[PDB]
Design a protein around this ligand. Structure first.
Ligand code: HEM
Length: 395
């Protein structure tokens, strides 16, 4: 049939399909025996229940085993212990103190880019890398062998998330970065300062401390998790504003409007449209029977466009209240994004600085249509933009 999800690149086709599935087949089993959950309430059910819906994907991957410290793949009770330890290092003030540096890097990168440039190469890709590397206390740039998440997301085929060859390909690209970070952890254990690696090595809650393997794996997650998403989100923000360009002047008149724009783009175009769980036992969602030991994909993108959860869900409306709102694009329940305040800060500052310098940007399709990611993330690999105004213009 059509027995696998449509690709991410054709966003309109994907959204239309998700709409039909919410209506007609809200819990769906694909040709790989992977289940998919489309309605907002059911996505929340799945994410809340950690006992039934495990975050350990290795349960269903032949030969695979858990990676110490990879907090997003660990279940309670270990998850709770680990989250406490890392939270005691990665604190609110650790994040808020980054604002001036975030602003400095952003302003300097944009000041040199001219009026026609790739937003991703110039800003959205380097900014989060630079910031989180400095937070961790890593050497200026990682101009080294570890590669690029953007390439992996394109080159490693991820159709069937239970395939062992896939888990291997992921470990193949990640292992060198994790080994590098493990060496940095050992170095900070020898001579700790107050960078985040040192704080992670010195952290201890209820007698639980991280070994270098766990700290390195956690630092790997933190690094990639903060990078991919913040890069994709900033592209999505500029793409979405270019579709509703009255908001550029609104935010220039009152930059206080920017946080709400960031939240609404997160709802509208979530960088991670889906999350994966594995059932630990037979269970039902929406009265649909799901067996034990299978993977379940929760479609946050579909939940966010579900009219049961959001009025006029396909309207981009930064004014929406969803009063006392939680942001499903950062998850739900105990794995809720640890990095959300940093993501919000980086994208606020970036949009502030774009508007301060240029007033607006528009997407440039002079040479080609955009190259969308086809899997995993909802976003584009590059985003050529044009500034119709900048401080370079003269009489
Ligand atoms: C807009 C940007 C971001 C988005 C959309 C996002 C999204 C998410 C989502 C959906 C989850 C839940 C995963 C699940 O339930 O399986 C999550 C968890 C996590 N995120 Fe983010 N993230 C973002 C930025 C960041 C940043 C900047 C950092 C690091 C500074 C970060 C670090 C993490 C970590 C460590 C977890 C795992 C928490 C746990 O398992 O307890 N994220 N994020």
């Amino acid at each position: 049939t059509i027995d696998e999800v449509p690709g991410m690149a054709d966003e309109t086709a994907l959204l239309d399909w998700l709409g039909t599935m919410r209506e007609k087949q809200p819990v769906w089993q694909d040709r790989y025996g992977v289940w998919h959950v489309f309605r907002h309430a059911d996505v929340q059910t799945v994410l809340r229940d950690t006992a039934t819906f495990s975050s350990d994907p290795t349960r269903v991957i032949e030969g695979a085993s858990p990676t110490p410290g990879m907090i997003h793949e660990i279940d309670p009770p270990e998850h709770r212990a680990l989250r406490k330890v890392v939270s005691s290092a990665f604190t609110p003030r650790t994040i808020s103190d980054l604002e001036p540096r975030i602003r400095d890097v952003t302003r300097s990168l944009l000041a040199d880019a001219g009026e026609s440039f790739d937003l991703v190469d110039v800003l959205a890709f380097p900014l989060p890398v630079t910031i989180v590397a400095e937070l961790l206390g890593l050497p200026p740039m990682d101009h080294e062998q570890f590669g690029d998440w953007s390439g992996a997301l394109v080159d490693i085929q991820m159709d069937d998330p239970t395939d062992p060859a896939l888990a291997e390909r992921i470990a193949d690209v990640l292992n060198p970065l994790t080994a590098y970070l493990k060496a940095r952890c050992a170095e900070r254990r020898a001579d700790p300062g107050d960078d985040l690696i040192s704080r992670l090595v010195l952290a201890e809650v209820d007698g639980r401390a991280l070994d270098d393997e766990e700290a390195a794996n956690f630092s790997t997650a933190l690094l990639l998790a903060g990078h991919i998403t913040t890069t994709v989100l900033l592209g999505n923000i500029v793409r979405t504003l270019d579709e509703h360009p009255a908001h550029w002047d609104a935010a220039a008149e009152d930059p206080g409007r920017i946080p709400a724009i960031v939240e609404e783009v997160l709802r509208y175009r979530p960088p991670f449209p889906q999350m994966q769980r594995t059932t630990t036992k037979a269970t039902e969602v929406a009265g649909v029977p799901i067996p034990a030991d299978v993977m379940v994909n929760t479609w946050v993108l579909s939940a966010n466009r579900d009219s049961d959860a959001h009025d006029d869900p396909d309207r981009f409306d930064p004014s929406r209240k969803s009063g006392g709102a939680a942001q499903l694009s950062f998850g739900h329940g105990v794995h809720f994004c640890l990095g959300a305040p940093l993501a919000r800060l980086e994208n606020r500052v970036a949009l502030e600085e774009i508007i301060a310098r240029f007033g607006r940007l528009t997407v440039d399709r002079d040479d080609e249509r955009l190259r969308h990611f086809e899997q995993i993330v909802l976003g584009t690999r590059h985003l050529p933009v044009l500034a119709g105004s900048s401080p370079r213009q003269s009489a």
